[PDB]
What we know:
This is part of a larger assembly, with chains A (101 residues), B (99 residues), C (82 residues), D (114 residues), E (127 residues) and F (151 residues).
Chain B: E1 3-9, H1 12-28, E2 33-49, E3 59-73, H2 78-85, E4 93-98
Antiparallel strand pairs in B: 1-3, 1-4, 2-3
Chain C: H1 11-22, E1 29-31, E2 46-50, E3 55-59
Parallel strand pairs in C: 1-2
Antiparallel strand pairs in C: 2-3
Chain F: H1 21-29, H2 35-53, H3 59-66, E1 72-78, E2 83-89, H4 92-108, H5 115-127, H6 133-146
Antiparallel strand pairs in F: 1-2
The structure holds potassium ion (8 copies) and magnesium ion (MG) (15 copies).
Chain E binds one RNA strand of 242 nucleotides through residues 2, 4, 6, 10-15, 17, 34-38, 63-72, 96, 101-113, 116-127.
Amino acid sequence: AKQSMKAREVKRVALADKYFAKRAELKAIISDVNAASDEDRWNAVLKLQTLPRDSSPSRQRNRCRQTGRPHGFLRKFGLSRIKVREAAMRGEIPGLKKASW
Amino acid sequence: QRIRIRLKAFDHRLIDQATAEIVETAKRTGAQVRGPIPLPTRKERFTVLISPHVNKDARDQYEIRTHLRLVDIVEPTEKTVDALMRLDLAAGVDVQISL
Amino acid sequence: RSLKKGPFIDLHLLKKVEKAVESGDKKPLRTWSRRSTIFPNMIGLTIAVHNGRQHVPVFVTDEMVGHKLGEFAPTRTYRGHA
Amino acid sequence: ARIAGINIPDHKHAVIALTSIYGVGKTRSKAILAAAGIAEDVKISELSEGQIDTLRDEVAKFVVEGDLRREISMSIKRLMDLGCYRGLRHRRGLPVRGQRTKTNARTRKGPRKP
Amino acid sequence: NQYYGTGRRKSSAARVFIKPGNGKIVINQRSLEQYFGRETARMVVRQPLELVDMVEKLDLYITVKGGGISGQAGAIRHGITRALMEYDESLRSELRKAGFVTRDARQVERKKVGLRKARRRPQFSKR
Amino acid sequence: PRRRVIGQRKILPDPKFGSELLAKFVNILMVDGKKSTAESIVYSALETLAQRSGKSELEAFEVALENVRPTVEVKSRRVGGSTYQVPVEVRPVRRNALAMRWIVEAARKRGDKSMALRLANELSDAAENKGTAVKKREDVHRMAEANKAFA
RNA sequence: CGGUCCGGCCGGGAACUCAAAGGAGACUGCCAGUGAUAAACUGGAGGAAGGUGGGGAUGACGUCAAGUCAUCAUGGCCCUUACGACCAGGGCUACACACGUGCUACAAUGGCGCAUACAAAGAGAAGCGACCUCGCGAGAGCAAGCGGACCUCAUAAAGUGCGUCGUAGUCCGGAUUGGAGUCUGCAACUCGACUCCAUGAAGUCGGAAUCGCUAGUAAUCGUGGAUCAGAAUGCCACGGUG
Ligand SMILES: [K+]
Ligand SMILES: [K+]
Ligand SMILES: [K+]
Ligand SMILES: [K+]
Ligand SMILES: [K+]
Ligand SMILES: [K+]
Ligand SMILES: [K+]
Ligand SMILES: [K+]
Ligand SMILES: [Mg+2]
Ligand SMILES: [Mg+2]
Ligand SMILES: [Mg+2]
Ligand SMILES: [Mg+2]
Ligand SMILES: [Mg+2]
Ligand SMILES: [Mg+2]
Ligand SMILES: [Mg+2]
Ligand SMILES: [Mg+2]
Ligand SMILES: [Mg+2]
Ligand SMILES: [Mg+2]
Ligand SMILES: [Mg+2]
Ligand SMILES: [Mg+2]
Ligand SMILES: [Mg+2]
Ligand SMILES: [Mg+2]
Ligand SMILES: [Mg+2]
């Protein structure tokens, strides 16, 4: 199980849309040569570090939604390979039948 | 003007009858109906491991086919638009209208 | 390597080093930040950088400016096989 | 024929023969012959001497032959005495750029001794 | 009138129109020698009009799509065959014996799971 | 091939001449499915034989082909743990195949510049009954008439 | 067919390719011969296809106390100021060696330079990102279009034509290392991918032995996708030559 891993993951998700995709302006914009070429850009580069170590979209492991498995993820369904198979055979994923071409 | 209707579905019989329901209800208000045209179907494939552990060559291959139909209406009287916006089809069809 | 658009150094290390060059050299400055560029500002001070279990002290000469701190604290122990 | 590059390249096309000069590859050789106004399907034969030292001090504009070797080796000595990570790998004989060392480091470690 | 034929090979598709009484072979608004640089493709396209003989007795306007050189050449052959069969209706019997009428149905085989190719198997070793 | 006996597969003639034999030759010379390369090489070598040392341009090939074609072969047959080398007659098509293969493999292991002129020398000396394709034939024979008692 | 700026680009056409729904077609159905008046075998015709047309999915009763308590679920056992929980740094990338599976080579059926042909199948909104300008280049700036048979990824490579190299450890090979950079990312020391300049190991076809493949197959040449901020010689797919 390791429920605590799921807790870590959901905390990272929430805190990450908490800060970023809202305050990306500290790097996406102020780094521009047209924004600064001097102490302003340096002050922004150092300000980007006091935001928590989380809150980056680059720290989500993107686990399964039912069992929380790290590996074998499928972005289309949000499930691991095991769960998409066990649910596809039961007939719950629409339109997903066995392919043979 | 022209009004354009795009129909997407996961099976072809439901979307076939949905396109019917559209194109005769368009002729019911006496309108010219261009189509219906089958656009190419988009089939997305997936390949999964089927053991819980350590069995790399044992796999399953699934696919989802999306069927696409297009219909254009080129002589809309006012009783054609409402006459198309009142129509009841089962849940498998997604319609997108374009003015 | 990194972009020329700004070298990297942490905030806590930056403040610790400025206050240590104002206040005269001191204890081996204990740090964990192996990722920070060595600046001209601390030639002469002794920084004890973490290597996983210990803090290896390094005395910064002028040749070290531009390198990272972690380059001067090896993380793995190994001395022959047999 | 001798150049400022002290070596003596042999009688083949000039763009290839000037690469026997240590520190000059193919791009440098093309730049050399383009600044000298010399085509590069010309041999070291069939060439003037009032065309050879225009090459000689056209190539004198680069860091070349033994003076390059010194520049390289002291850049290695620097690391080897700095005590850095690249220095530890240079001073010992293991790959420096982060390659696998469990297997397949035979170019850096030489033929295998059991 | 136009006499028309459709021909297909591995992944190519060729449509062929033949007109009476002139010598133009034109494919994709190009000569035969401009299009097919390989004389084997040039030979394959002239095959059906060698038993069914001509000097310059019909001109043919061809277009092709898909595939490579051999696929397009074979598609054009098959299309010429079908077109001239619509033209005469009784050149069929000797074209059957030449093998020009059968649509070559060899398609490239799919790659299969666990295999490096359609049939090439990974190197096995006992231990 | 336990049960399913096989027929044959079609082969095109050659654009330039209209031969099946030489079309077999370029399939045996082709490597990696590069047919254009092999056609180029074989035309380049064969004209190089014809007007440098030679006849009407198809005859000059068959005269070198006949003098390397073997007439008898060795095939081995097991006892209970012994295998006799029994000499056997070679069938026509296998004769042409063996000749073409030996010519190609002798031409492959020479020391000259092109492949066309390597092929050229080998075919020229096969016309003169020397080289190493012809001696391949000579010693397959030698071994066949050494085991002449096991017919 | 008309017109044209010579591009299906406009009028226009619904023929053709194609798209995707429906339908037809192959059944030893037909004709000979053999066969136990058999079931079936050889051959022929017609036909796009002939004898299971090609490929796939489909894996009987059971075997190996085979594998997985680390996907999940679960009987019993064990921990409960720690075998639970949070954080920073490190490690999973170590290196005397041995083995398995791959990629690149040892060259002329080739290497390099210039010119020029012919694909299929896919993906895309915190996404794909054109045109133009700057940079030798990786890329940067500006910014259109696209939830897509429309826009982008994206100018396929082997191939063909011309020139050169002329059998060399080479104009083969591109490992290793030095310097200078780009981009993603809080952050590229340990430990990322890519670019430029320079460096140019081994390697000249591989012992005993051993593997795959019966036709669009083997061999070879490129393309795409999932995972994914970035990071394939792996995996899963696609066509070309053959
Ligand atoms: K050089
Ligand atoms: K390593
Ligand atoms: K349990
Ligand atoms: K680590
Ligand atoms: K590999
Ligand atoms: K290997
Ligand atoms: K070289
Ligand atoms: K990625
Ligand atoms: Mg990630
Ligand atoms: Mg690595
Ligand atoms: Mg293939
Ligand atoms: Mg495998
Ligand atoms: Mg029609
Ligand atoms: Mg069955
Ligand atoms: Mg067990
Ligand atoms: Mg076990
Ligand atoms: Mg366990
Ligand atoms: Mg940690
Ligand atoms: Mg590991
Ligand atoms: Mg050699
Ligand atoms: Mg078989
Ligand atoms: Mg290759
Ligand atoms: Mg690929």
